[PDB]
Amino acid sequence: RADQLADESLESTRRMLQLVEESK
Amino acid sequence: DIKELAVETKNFSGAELEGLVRAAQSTAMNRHIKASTKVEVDMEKAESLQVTRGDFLASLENDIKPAFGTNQEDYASYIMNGIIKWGDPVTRVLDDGELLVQQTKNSDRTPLVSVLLEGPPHSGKTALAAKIAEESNFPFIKICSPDKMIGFSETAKCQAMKKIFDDAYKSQLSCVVVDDIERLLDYVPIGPRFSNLVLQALLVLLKKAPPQGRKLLIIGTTSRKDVLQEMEMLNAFSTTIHVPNIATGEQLLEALELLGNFKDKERTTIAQQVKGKKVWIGIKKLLMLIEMSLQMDPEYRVRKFLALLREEGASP
Amino acid sequence: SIINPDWNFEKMGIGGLDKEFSDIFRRAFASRVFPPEIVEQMGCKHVKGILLYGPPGCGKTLLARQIGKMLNAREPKVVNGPEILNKYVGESEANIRKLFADAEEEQRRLGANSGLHIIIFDEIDAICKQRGSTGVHDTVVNQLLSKIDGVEQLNNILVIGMTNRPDLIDEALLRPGRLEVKMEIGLPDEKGRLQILHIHTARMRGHQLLSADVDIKELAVETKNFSGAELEGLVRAAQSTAMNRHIKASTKVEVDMEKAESLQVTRGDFLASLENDIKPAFGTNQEDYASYIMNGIIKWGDPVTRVLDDGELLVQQTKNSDRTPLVSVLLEGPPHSGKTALAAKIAEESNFPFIKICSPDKMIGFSETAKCQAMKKIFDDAYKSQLSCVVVDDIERLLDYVPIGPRFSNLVLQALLVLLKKAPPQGRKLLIIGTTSRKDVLQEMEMLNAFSTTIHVPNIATGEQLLEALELLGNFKDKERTTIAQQVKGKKVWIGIKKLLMLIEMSLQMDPEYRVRKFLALLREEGASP
Amino acid sequence: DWNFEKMGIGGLDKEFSDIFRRAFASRVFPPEIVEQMGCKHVKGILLYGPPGCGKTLLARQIGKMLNAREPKVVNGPEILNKYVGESEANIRKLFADAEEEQRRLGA
Amino acid sequence: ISKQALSEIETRHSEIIKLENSIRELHD
Amino acid sequence: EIETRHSEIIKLENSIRELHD
Ligand SMILES: Nc1ncnc2c1ncn2[C@@H]1O[C@H](COP(=O)(O)OP(=O)(O)OP(=O)(O)O)[C@@H](O)[C@H]1O
Ligand SMILES: Nc1ncnc2c1ncn2[C@@H]1O[C@H](COP(=O)(O)OP(=O)(O)OP(=O)(O)O)[C@@H](O)[C@H]1O
Ligand SMILES: Nc1ncnc2c1ncn2[C@@H]1O[C@H](COP(=O)(O)OP(=O)(O)O)[C@@H](O)[C@H]1O
Ligand SMILES: Nc1ncnc2c1ncn2[C@@H]1O[C@H](COP(=O)(O)OP(=O)(O)O)[C@@H](O)[C@H]1O
Known part of the structure; x- marks a missing residue:
């Protein structure tokens, strides 16, 4: 099940970093 | 039909x-197709397709092999050189076997009968048992031999006995052939020594009746009756038959004539030398001697044969 | 389609x-x-x-x-x-x-x-x-x-x-x-x-x-x-041999590859590879014979000719018969008489496509079950040819006999006895040769009924025979020969060939003066009668 | 004629010639004529003898001189496990590199 | 032949759905 | 992986606080 964990976690980091930079 | x-x-x-029907149909249709290296279908011949008795007979003889029925190769691997009436006893033995099979087939109060065949070595009694079994026409016939148990332990042997008898227990009529009882017991005159477990299994397995009115027949063969009598095992068996050797020179001449060997004056000269004495030999040794004697030139064959017969014709 | x-x-x-x-x-x-x-x-x-x-x-x-x-x-x-x-x-x-x-x-x-x-x-x-x-x-x-x-x-x-x-x-x-x-x-x-x-x-x-x-x-x-x-594998080996023939003359010296391009595999390559590269699993193997026949077969007396003729007759009978696909023969004699060598020679002279020998030597320390497995495996492999020959040597050793007791492994005995009377599948031939040294005890175990015939290998029993054997061996000189002949002819001797060779080697270590004397003394000491 | 001197192994010199003659003739001769012959290379050789007689050194020298990749050393007794057979797992990891190499680069 | 298995959990409190709603709202 | 997630959480904390200011 770790596969979808890694997938969602990469997706989360990418979106969070991007979204933070846009807000900033 | x-x-x-x-x-x-x-x-x-x-x-x-x-499966039989499918195989017959497959053979029938394959008849029409004519293609070896390049696939090809003769559509012209496919217009009229029918199945004849030949398909069924070929499939029966070659393709399908029943698991609980009787199989023909077993009877081929034991009667190798047929049965030749060299004397009266053969007819007696065959008739006695007929009578026993008749009794077991058409009697109540006795669904289990056992017979013992005994005689000197090389007398050819193993084949006679197979012949007797072949004339019963029973749906289920089986032969159990030590030939297929090389190196087995006691437990394996007894489990083989179990499996064969249990399978036999599942038909209306059944015949079982046990060959060379002594070899099953692992006998040796020194000691003496043997496997007790197999003996107990056999002794207890000659009295268990088939459930709810099913028949059964057991034919056992051996060559050393004295040991068996010392084992109290002859009580288990219901009767006993005897298979003798050849004794008289006339019997030897009859056998020689029947076999298709030395003839003409040859026979005559041979007759001049054997008739005035007694002979004692089993047929299997006679065949071996005949074969061995045929490798010399056509000038001493009779001499070599006679010298051998003298050396081995012991205890007349 | x-x-x-x-x-x-x-x-x-x-x-x-x-x-x-x-x-x-x-x-x-x-x-x-x-x-x-x-x-x-x-x-x-x-x-x-x-x-x-x-x-x-x-x-x-x-x-x-x-x-x-x-x-x-x-x-x-x-x-x-x-x-x-x-x-x-x-x-x-x-x-x-x-x-x-x-x-x-x-x-x-x-x-x-x-x-x-x-x-x-x-x-x-x-x-x-x-x-x-x-x-x-x-x-x-x-x-x-x-x-x-x-x-x-x-x-x-x-x-x-x-x-x-x-x-x-x-x-x-x-x-x-x-x-x-x-x-x-x-x-x-x-x-x-x-x-x-x-x-x-x-x-x-x-x-x-x-x-x-x-x-x-x-x-x-x-x-x-x-x-x-x-x-x-044979074809590949032939190619590799033809190749190596050119790796030492053209590319070795870096000379014109024209002679390297003239590469052509020839019959010589095949006939050199077919003898030293490939060992078939179901075919003859010409190393056991040379390993068993260590000193050839010298003719010292008539019995050898009789034995060889009898073996040839047995082989022909097996090959040419139809109603007797299985045949057996047992060789017996006193110890050190040369049984194994004679069996190996007669087996070699059969020309059958499959041959095999089995000795106690290749099973030391095993257990009875392993020996049985080996024997059944050998016989099963043999069953698959149209013509075959197997040799079972030193039967007494397989059973582990010892006079005290006696004791032995009954299981291996039963396996061997049963195997000796099993025909192969339809249309295939077989031939079994056995070697022993104690025919009596073999008889008490009832096993001689299985065998079809027997042959006897005697020993040397005459001074003339001993002198002929010495002459044929190529040792000692005329005067020594005469002294030995004028000494030994009077009495009788009883010795196996192998012990004779051992004794000759023993005697050939002293000085030239005393060699004959030591030989004679030892020969007399190691003497006996039936 | 190869060369086996002053590079570690010194005791065994005829053995290299013998083994090369028996084994390494396909890989030394120009590949063009070889594919014309349509032949396959040998797929393994055995070494045996008394312990501590410089067998590993010989293998490493052979590996170096053929320009092959890094040998993947392994021992016998190490590969054994009590989980109703997990040896096949141990066995299979070893041939991956060859599998992927063949998949990608082909022939 | 033998062996059984097991499983475990971990502290994750993702709630990426709610954080995604929130951040999208922030963008608009 | 997890170390990268720790770096991400640290960065996110910093960014959130300075966003607040
Ligand atoms: N009239 C006959 N009666 C019996 N056997 C015959 C007769 N004619 C030919 N034979 C052949 O004799 C051989 C009988 O050998 P068989 O093995 O049965 O002997 P045996 O003495 O019962 O020994 P074993 O217990 O080892 O089987 C068979 O090949 C059979 O074909
Ligand atoms: N003509 C010959 N006959 C017999 N043996 C010979 C003859 N010529 C040479 N030899 C040598 O005799 C020796 C035969 O020994 P072999 O092992 O056959 O004897 P054996 O009596 O069967 O012994 P063992 O009981 O130890 O097996 C071999 O060295 C063989 O080279
Ligand atoms: N009759 C044959 N003709 C050509 N090559 C063969 C033949 N039998 C075996 N081989 C070769 O042997 C190699 C391995 O065979 P394998 O499948 O291991 O044999 P088996 O199926 O008997 O175990 C194959 O690469 C094949 O080229
Ligand atoms: N022919 C040789 N020349 C030089 N050193 C050797 C030779 N044979 C063995 N050695 C040395 O002996 C040691 C053991 O050799 P090793 O390769 O382990 O042999 P093995 O594979 O038989 O164990 C190594 O350290 C090696 O250097």
Whole structure:
């Protein structure tokens, strides 16, 4: 099940970093 | 015809008649197709397709092999050189076997009968048992031999005995052949030494009746009756038959004539030398001697044969 | 069609298997080419199982793949045989089920129109053993048998199994309803060998790189009891020899490769490789004879000629008979008389394609079961030829006899006794030769009834014979010879040849003066009578 | 003629010639004529003898001189486990590199 | 033949759905 | 992986606080 964990976690980091930079 | 097919097939399972039919159809249709290296279909010949008795007979003889029925190769691997009436005793033995099979087939109060065949070595008694079994026409016939148990332990042997007898217990009529009882027991005159477990299994296995009115027949063969009598095992068996050797020179001449060997003046000269004495030999040794004697030139064959017969014709 | 649009038998490259391919086609492929209308009018059901059994060295795998491509197969799935195994509980069953997913999906989606799926299992005997706890090997067979002819119905599958031992497979898998047809692949004959050689030499003949001196019929004749793998190895070895012949003259010195481009494999390469590179598994092996016959066979008396003639007569009788496929002979004599060497020589002079010898030496420290396994394996291997010869040496040693007691292993005795009276399959010949030194005890064990005949090897018993043996051996001089002759002729002697050689070596270590005296003294000391 | 001197192994010199003659003739001769011959290379060789007689050194020298990749050393007794057979797992990891190499680069 | 299995959990409190709603709202 | 997630959480904390200011 770790596969979808890694997938969602990469997706989360990418979106969070991007979204933070846009807000900033 | 369907009646002939139904009669001719016995003890077949539901899964086997369908396979027979499929194989017959496959052979029938394959008849039309003519292609070896390049696939090709002769559509012209496919216009009229029908199945004849030949398909069924070929499939029966070659393709399908029943698991609980009787199989023909077993009877081929034991009667190698046929049966020749060299004397009266053979007819007596065959008739006695007929009588025993008759009693077991058409009697109540006795669904289990056992007979013992005994005689000197090389007398050819193993083949006679197979012959007797072949004339019963029983749906289920089986032979159990030590030939297939090389190196087995005691437990394996007894489990083989179990499996064969249990399988036999599942038909209306059954015959079982036990060969060379002594070899099963692992006998040796020194000690003496043997396997007690197999003996107990056999002794207890000659009295268990088949459940709810099913018949059974057991034929055992051996060559050393004295040891058996010392084992109290002759009580288990219900009767006993004897197979003797050849004794008289006239019998030897009859056998020689029947075999298709030394003839003409040869025979005459041979007759001049054996008639005035007694002879004692089993047929299997006679065949071996005949074969061995035929490798010399056509000038001493009779001499070599006679010298051998003298050396081995012991205890007249 | 369900088959590829293009295919021809000759292209497949398989050589020798002609009737087997025809029968497999007729049985398992008849109904899949006959037009659908008449087939649905048939309502018959295609076969969905096939088994192949052959001895090692036939590469039936070639046949497996070649049949797979012969058809318009999609992607034959393969399993080695030990795979699909895991430590965790309930995993192999799932893996087995995963195999049929595509077939079931197509069967549900389409019907009477789905393509064929082929599965190639390797060595079915590995896992599909008799179902008795058999550990995981019992839960897997049930699932497999559960899949095949299940509560549901599949009609677009086909399963091919390969195994070398067909009598250790679960019987429940062997029914009129699954894996029905079974076929045997055996060793080829001369014609098959020729065809295989043609197949493996076509490319070399194409580029004019095969010398015109080589002949293929001769090669096919000589190679006996050979298999396809062995023959391909032979061709490769010949190529490598022809190659190495040029690695020391042209490319070694970096000189014009014109002489390197004149490379041509010749008959010499084959006839050098056929003797020192390839050892057939089912064929003769010319190293045991030289290992046993350490000092040749010198003729010191008439009995040797008689023994050799008798052995020749036995061999001819076995070869030429029809109603006596099995024959036996027993050699006996006093210790150190030269039994093993004579048996080896008579065996060598038979010219049979298969020969084997078995000695206690190759089983030291074993247990009785292992000895029985070895003996049965040897005899089973021998059963597979059309002509064979086996030698069992020092019978007394196999049984582990010792006069005190006595004691011995009864089990091996029973195994040997039973084996001595088992005929091979139909149409094949055999010949057994035994060696012993204690014929009496052999008689009390009732085993002499099995044997068909016996031969006697005597010892030397006369001074004339001893002098002739010394002369033929090539030792000592005229005066020494005369002194020995004038001394020994009076009395009688009793000694085996081997001990005589030992004694001569013993005596040949002193000074020239005392050699004869020591020889005579020892000879007298080591003397006895019947 | 190869060369085996002053590079570690010194005791065994004829053995290299013998083994090369028996084994390494296909890989030394220009590949063009070879593919014309349509022949396959040997797929393994055995070494045996008394312990501590410089067998590993010989293998490493052979590996170096053939320009092959880094040898993957392994021992016998190490590969054994009590989990109803997990040896096949141990066995299979070893041939991955060859599998992927063949898949990608082909022939 | 033998062996059984097991399983476990971990502290994750993702709630990426709610954080995604929030951040999208922030963008608009 | 987890170390990268720790770096991400640290960065996100910093960014959130300075966003607040
Ligand atoms: N009239 C006959 N009666 C018996 N056997 C015959 C007769 N004619 C030919 N034979 C042949 O004799 C051989 C009988 O050998 P068989 O093995 O049965 O001997 P045996 O003394 O019972 O020994 P064993 O217990 O080892 O089987 C068979 O080949 C059979 O074909
Ligand atoms: N003509 C010959 N006859 C017999 N042996 C010979 C002859 N010429 C040479 N020899 C030598 O005799 C020796 C035969 O020994 P072999 O092992 O056969 O004897 P053995 O009596 O069977 O002994 P063992 O009981 O130890 O097996 C071999 O060295 C063989 O080289
Ligand atoms: N009759 C044959 N003709 C050509 N090659 C063969 C033949 N039999 C075996 N081989 C060769 O032997 C090799 C391995 O065979 P293998 O499948 O291991 O034999 P088996 O199936 O008996 O175990 C194959 O690469 C094949 O080329
Ligand atoms: N012919 C040789 N020349 C130089 N050193 C050797 C030779 N044979 C063995 N050795 C040395 O002996 C040691 C053991 O050799 P090793 O390669 O382990 O042999 P093995 O593989 O038989 O164990 C190594 O350290 C090696 O340097």
